[PDB]
């Protein structure tokens, strides 16, 4: 905040002289100063920047309408009018509402006029700036001597070594000082929720419609671990998506909990959908209760709200027909939920305070929204017992917090209050609608094949479009009408090699040369799958990556029909083995991977292998106590059916925990053991396209191996 | 890195317009130039700074010698000799292993000179990085657009909305860039331990000495846990510190663990000293196993190594005589040991492989070391089960980590190779003698009372000073010899209070109003108890932050005697009820507190209720189990005796746990009850000096609430 | 390649403040800025002249027929189109198979856009730049000391003698580090067509039409020799 802007000159010089000399007194006390033309040219200054911090125009030649639109455009920004003809008289009630300080053209009065525009730019920043990080750029800036923890206080150790200094030069100085502990008592602890803190998780609770909001430092992989440690006791029985993260199983690891999995759909893209609403009723609950061993009533739920490629639920069916006493949504991908209404009924937090169960909601705030990695919240919605929850929450948290990372948490909800978050969502929201819109519109302009994007054929409105079961779009057979809702800003490209109804074309190009293009011309992409790709359109992209990307999408196709070499078009993959790729065009690669992907049935068994659910003989706490007391031997891959898994699979594709560690491939499951093998199989020929299963372990002679129990 | 040392004018032309035409090419290529004025200056400035990379010189009027005091003082600086006179003839084998590149003297050859120079910097700056740190600012300098979490994509979120404006010009663009996920594939994974993130584990054992090293990106509060999940089973038993942190028995209540608590010892002050030699043996531990129900033989042990306050132990006598099949020591605050070779036989690490058990060491990075919060270690010594461990680790950390942290924990190793890290190490060990040498000399230089410090009479060499047991500046009774060691760089002040026999004298200052001195002068103290303070000398500290604190406290003493009021001397404290502090001076507020501490008989009480342990009920697990399942009431303070306690009860002073989850208060140990009674009963009188107990709850009236389990 | 124009003054601050932040930035960057005042302006400059390495222009008076023009006069040309009136959605296919590269009008980040510049202008050279060309220019560029032959090893025997500072002086140091010779292992060699030669050769046989193109260094007084000697044995006609 910086930047002060002066609309034109009049002409006469009256009202001249005095703007010249609070010019040369503003750039007098720092501040850089702009020189918008007209109108028009400041709307546009305003809605391209954010660092101006204060606009001075004259009152007579501009009204008190640019006053309107920059309120709706900015509501806290200060602005100066300059009165000269228009009296005390002429001032409506909008106009005082608003964030203007009139002043008079005096000649030799710049100076205290140039103190209150600095005193009113102050008054912005600490009015705009969320209490904690608010008390940590103070503290920064009043930057006082430390005997405590952290070891470089300030920074000052990285100014006495070459890397160390190599690493301060990098990183600068204000994130340096910003490192400090819970040894500065001005700025309360995280751990206790006082002071500062305690104001910042009440913020976090206005901001984002919840009870009580906490801040997690290490991230929602700890977070669910929080709510289910708290949620669940030992002995206890969960009802966990199957469409999970590994954090789930790794809490479902340390705690003696028992499951029953619900059952997601899914296509033959692989794309995890969702549960059915049958899966959701009190009947198949209480059956499944019934033929799992050792298992009583539920007493927690866990969902993935959205699931990987944004689907959301409808949530108050979920609220209202899941009868459990607590039912958790695991909304890492949709922290973004409040800020605008087109999420209303997605949430945990949509609605009122659901009776007689706890909601919860773990918005991994780093992912979509503006914040440092390793950040996330636990929003609550409902009564919980408060020093049991905060002990919980206490036992996996640090104790001496990254506090950069804690006020990029609440500096993240901060960046959502007022008319610029909306505009940030809704713009975010209409741009990843517009490049959907034109994705399909080049996949019809062009000659050939083009990126297909896995959406409903006709889109023309800002909403979560539903799933419906009268169209095709989709691919999740017999789905049920309102249950899932496309998230417009999680776009899923896809590449040729597919039909509409399932089966597998001829010619097509895998998602992964795409993706090692893009990654090549310096664009990434998310995750891939055999033939999707993912663009995460949070708040950051703007137009300029967004033409960039559908740019690298065309010359790839140019380079693909052109039939370039691997030599000279993915330099990063040719030097994987460059004797394998020394003389083989792009076509020939993909016309094999694709051949490769075809003759061994990939989508077939992909779909069969997650439509069948691996035999739980123990729960996965006793195969983690069991796998500590050194149980475990490496059987090879094939000789794995009737024996007890040790550690979680979790191929790629697509990307969802197949077997969970504690559970048994029977003869039922046999297509489990087909789809691994011959994804190690696949795996095995084309250098860069290596297999990637997370449990299975390669050995030298291109058999793997997984770690089962012993007998 | 842009700083390059030119020597002084020879005063002929030849030698002296390349030497200018150099300087003029060298600042096109953006390199800052200075200009010592001759050898000593060189020296002076090499030792003052770190950005310096670069010492040009002729090679007639200096000699090589100074290319080998250079090296002393950094090993891989280049500097650029000149041959003029000296042929190829005169250079000795000592000069070929040095970081010299010879030149000569021609006009208009500047620019190539120039173009080797900043390629020879390239290469220093690439030499003395890590390697992930080097891939990392590889990857930010080639800074390309991305699609995928986090959500800022860059930080140009931040440059969109007004408070995100400020988050971004406060930390500056290379702090946003840095921050990435998983999905950038070049970078590899921390999780999977690939790329560089496994060069970076390599590079971590090589420098700490270890087998297999880990970084953790929670903290050690995490790591604790990590080791503690895999060595220690459920069902199985420990031998824990009762000097422990909060992470531990939160690591307790999640496994089904049983202990043993380890007794240390403690002096009159309040500082936690160390287990005997008596309870290492296998007669103490097989003794207090058969007296513990549903006990076993341990097959783990936690060492808090050093304690809070800095006293290390013979480790080598731990590693020979603890018969247990895996030994952890909890070096939160020693991270430093293996740079400098004091602190030989003073770790985990320290000697070699140990046969028979597993060494383990969680050095926090963070805390005396220079990197990022949250960073934390995990160094084994031994054979481990190389995927259960690592799925361990897995378990407890998050699965998209702060990249900053990572490489921040890496380049604190970095810091320490070479002799730049041994200069540090030393430099610090040297500082923090020399400060401890002129405060006892200022005590005997003052009149009336000054600040003591708790370390032997005689200091004079830079080693850990032993605890003997033929002295008493320790004050712990009846010590074994060569236990305890001394760590020189965390300095305990001392106030006015204490007799040297352990008695209370009758003048006194307890420790919070010199702390809340210090504070009102901007510096911080790290924690302080009833009469010491801590002073963390790490690697940070230069003589300017010792000098201040050193001349805040001879200012304190000095408005002491003159014996100002609260609200000239104390405005922080004062602002806390103004009506109170109105019409006091310091003299009465510290004796009356002194007074206080005085008639209530505290450190005898403080001493009395740690030499009686608690009544173990069942284990802390069985507590946190009966906790979540709502069989909890608040009984008040006075009621609490016959009954299990839920929450871990633990009081400042000290700040080690007294009651644990689980234990019960009994007859024998009523002395717990009167402690946690006077410390609530003082700590309702004087405001600022509030009750500090973590799990006693303040009610209205003025009594206190603990959480036991219900009958 | 250091010549990159930028389109007329608007007339408005907001796209001719960071128009002015980015000249500054690409003047640091050690680019010519060239003021081309209207459309035949950029036209003629561009036919006239082939050191122009980019062009940058507003989307929003100049369409995009302005990029199809520059295509036919030169394809690989990048331009910087900046937008914005015109959303995501006002492009074309045959826009997207141009080289241009989109740009935003924000205050202070005129640094990473000269950057993003300086990449696709190294990009551009690294593009139209045949191989082995390309290798010698980038091995002249990181120039080493070589103890081979040829002599001069780099132009610096020519450094030292008054004739020799003569040749030096006309020829410049570029063609003079551009001579080395088959020891140098990274360009391959002729003789034994490797690396960047056989590179260089199999892009002269895609050029001419041949199945193998061969580069002789003597002339084709000495090619006319080669065919005559391999073609017609002796004892033939």
């Known amino acids: 905040m910086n930047v002060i802007a002066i609309l034109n000159h009049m002409g006469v010089y009256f009202k001249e002289e005095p703007i010249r000399e609070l010019h040369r007194a503003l750039e007098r006390l720092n501040f850089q100063i702009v020189?918008?033309?007209?109108?028009?040219?400041?709307?546009?200054?305003?809605?391209?920047?954010?660092?101006?911090?204060?606009?001075?125009?004259?009152?007579?030649?501009?009204?008190?309408?640019?006053?309107?639109?920059?309120?709706?455009?900015?509501?806290?920004l200060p602005l100066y009018a300059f009165a000269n003809t228009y009296s005390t008289l002429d001032v409506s009630l909008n106009d005082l509402r608003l964030q203007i300080s009139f002043f008079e053209y005096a000649l030799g009065a710049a100076e205290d006029i140039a103190n209150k525009i600095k005193q009113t730019t102050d008054e912005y920043i600490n009015t705009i700036l969320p209490p904690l990080t608010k008390a940590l750029f103070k503290y920064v800036r009043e930057g006082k001597y430390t005997f405590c923890t952290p070891g470089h206080m300030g920074g000052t150790a990285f100014q006495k070594s070459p890397v160390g200094s190599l690493f301060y030069d990098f990183f600068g100085p204000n994130t340096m000082k910003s490192d400090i502990s819970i040894s500065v008592s001005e700025l309360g602890s995280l751990l206790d929720h006082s002071g500062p803190h305690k104001e910042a998780e009440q913020y976090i609770a206005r901001v984002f419609n919840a009870d009580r909001s906490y801040m997690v430092t290490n991230g929602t992989s700890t977070a669910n671990k929080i709510v289910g440690m708290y949620s669940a006791p030992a002995g206890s029985t969960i009802l966990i998506d199957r469409n999970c993260h590994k954090s789930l199983t790794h809490l479902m690891m340390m705690s003696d909990v028992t499951p029953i999995y619900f059952r997601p759909t899914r296509n033959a893209y692989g794309i995890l959908g969702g549960i059915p609403q049958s899966e959701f009723q009190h009947a198949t609950i209480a059956k499944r209760v019934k033929e799992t061993p050792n298992a009583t009533w539920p007493v927690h739920a866990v969902i993935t709200n959205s699931t990987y490629d944004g689907l959301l639920y409808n949530t108050?069916?979920?609220?209202?027909?899941?009868?459990?006493?607590?039912?958790?949504?695991?909304s890492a991908w949709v922290p973004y939920t409040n800020f605008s209404p087109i999420y209303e009924g997605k949430c945990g937090m949509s609605g009122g305070r659901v009776e007689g169960k706890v909601i919860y909601e773990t918005q991994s705030t780093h992912k979509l929204l503006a914040a440092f990695s390793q950040a996330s919240m636990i929003h609550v919605k409902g009564d919980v017992n408060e020093e049991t929850f905060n002990e919980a929450y206490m036992m996996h948290t640090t104790t001496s917090p990254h506090y950069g990372i804690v006020a990029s948490t609440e500096t993240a909800a901060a960046m959502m209050k007022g008319n610029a978050g909306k505009r940030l969502i809704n713009g975010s929201i209409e741009r990843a609608i517009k490049f959907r819109k034109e994705i399909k519109r080049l996949r019809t302009e062009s000659d050939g094949w083009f990126f297909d994007v896995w959406q409903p054929d006709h889109i023309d409105t800002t909403e979560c479009w539903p799933l419906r079961s009268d169209s095709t779009w989709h691919g999740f057979k017999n789905i049920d009408n309102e249950h899932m809702y496309?998230?417009?800003?999680?776009?899923?490209?896809?590449?040729?090699?597919?039909?509409?109804?399932?089966?597998?074309?001829?010619?097509?190009?895998?998602a992964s040369i795409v993706a090692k293009y893009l990654d090549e011309h310096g664009i990434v992409v998310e995750k891939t799958g055999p033939y999707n790709l993912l663009f995460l359109f949070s708040i950051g992209i703007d137009k300029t990556k967004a033409l960039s990307l559908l740019r690298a999408l065309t010359d790839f196709k140019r380079a693909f029909d052109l039939n370039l070499r691997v030599k000279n078009m993915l330099p990063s993959l040719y030097r994987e083995d460059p004797e394998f790729y020394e003389n083989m065009r792009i076509q020939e690669l993909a016309q094999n991977i694709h051949k490769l992907i075809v003759h061994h049935n990939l989508p077939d068994l992909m779909y069969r292998a997650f439509e069948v659910l691996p035999t739980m003989v123990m729960t996965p706490y006793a195969a983690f106590q069991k796998e500590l007391h050194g149980m475990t031997e490496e059987v090879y891959l094939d000789e794995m059916v009737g024996r007890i898994n040790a550690n979680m699979i979790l191929p790629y594709p697509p990307g969802?925990?197949?077997?969970?560690?504690?559970?048994?491939?029977?003869?039922?499951?046999?297509?489990?053991?087909?789809?691994?093998q011959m994804l190690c199989e696949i795996g095995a020929h084309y250098p860069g396209f290596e297999t990637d299963i997370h449990g299975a372990y390669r050995q030298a002679d291109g058999r793997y191996t997984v770690k089962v129990l012993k007998e």
Chains 1, 2 share one sequence.
Request: aromatic share 8%; charged share 30%; net charge negative.
């Open 35 to 76: 020189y918008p033309n007209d109108r028009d040219d400041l709307l546009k200054l305003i809605e391209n920047n954010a660092r101006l911090c204060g606009v001075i125009f004259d009152w007579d030649k501009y009204n008190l309408e640019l006053c309107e639109e920059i309120s709706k455009m900015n509501e806290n």
């Open 316 to 330: 108050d069916f979920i609220k209202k027909t899941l009868d459990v006493k607590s039912i958790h949504f695991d």
């Open 486 to 510: 496309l998230d417009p800003i999680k776009v899923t490209l896809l590449t040729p090699g597919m039909e509409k109804d399932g089966t597998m074309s001829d010619f097509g190009i895998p």
């Open 656 to 676: 969802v925990p197949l077997v969970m560690p504690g559970e048994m491939i029977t003869e039922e499951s046999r297509p489990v053991l087909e789809f691994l």
